[PDB]
A paper describes a structure:
PDE6D binds to and sequesters the lipid of cytoplasmic RAS and has been proposed to deliver GTPase to recycling endosomes, which is followed by release mediated by the small G-protein Arf-like 2 (ARL2), allowing RAS to be trafficked back to the plasma membrane. Here, we present a novel strategy for targeting RAS by stabilizing its interaction with the prenyl-binding protein PDE6D and disrupting its localization.
Within their HVR sequences, both HRAS and NRAS contain a cysteine residue in the −5 position relative to the modified C-terminal cysteine. We were successfully able to cocrystallize PDE6D with C-terminally modified peptides of both HRAS and NRAS. The crystal structure containing HRAS peptide contains two copies of the complex, each in a different conformation. In one complex, the density is readily interpreted for six amino acids including both cysteine residues, while in the second PDE6D:HRAS complex, only the carboxymethylated farnesylated C-terminal cysteine can be confidently modeled. As the −2 cysteine is solvent-exposed, it is possible that it could be targeted with an irreversible small molecule.
Numbering used by the authors: 2 to 150
């Protein structure tokens, strides 16, 4: 469309290879996926162990490939509970070499146990909406429904 064919070019050349969730304090891998949760237009599912809610902070690794150059690769994540936006996250990777494969690590600090909701209430009710950007270029929007198992 009129909005850059480059955005569509980046998307066709972009692949999310795998993703990790780690205990930020110990480095134990708590959850791993190899499904491209960045694919737009379908509601992905993620089933993560309930024990993750025990962590004070988690480290999320995104390993991605991109045939296309990007000047300022970043993402915006809204966390929804039953359609209510609870959290808005911003993460920047920066410059993406064309044809590169990159591991992207981010630290997610957890809310206190006394302020965070139980797994039984959260599971199936949390939607993460991720917008993938090259600076101001919206490359894709993806939605993942969270289950705590
Ligand atoms: C430690 O307590 C917490 O902070 C709990 N509430 C969550 S830890 C963190 C994150 C997740 C669980 C889900 C992370 C996001 C996923 C799997 C999907 C995002 C999609 C993309 C493509 C980045």
């Amino acid at each position: 469309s009129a909005k850059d064919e480059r955005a569509r070019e980046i998307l066709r050349g972009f692949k999310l290879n795998w993703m990790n969730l780690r205990d930020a304090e110990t480095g134990k891998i708590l959850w791993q996926g190899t499904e491209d949760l960045s694919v737009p237009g379908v509601e992905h599912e993620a089933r993560v162990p309930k024990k993750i809610l025990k962590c004070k902070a988690v480290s999320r690794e995104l390993n991605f490939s991109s045939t296309e150059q990007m000047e300022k690769f970043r993402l915006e994540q809204k966390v929804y509970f039953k359609g209510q936006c609870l959290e808005e996250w911003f993460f920047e990777f920066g410059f993406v070499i064309p044809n590169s494969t990159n591991t992207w690590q981010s630290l997610i600090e957890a809310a206190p146990e006394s302020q965070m909701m139980p797994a039984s209430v959260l599971t199936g009710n949390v939607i993460i909406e991720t917008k993938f950007f090259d600076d101001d270029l919206l490359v894709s929007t993806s939605r993942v429904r969270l289950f705590y198992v």
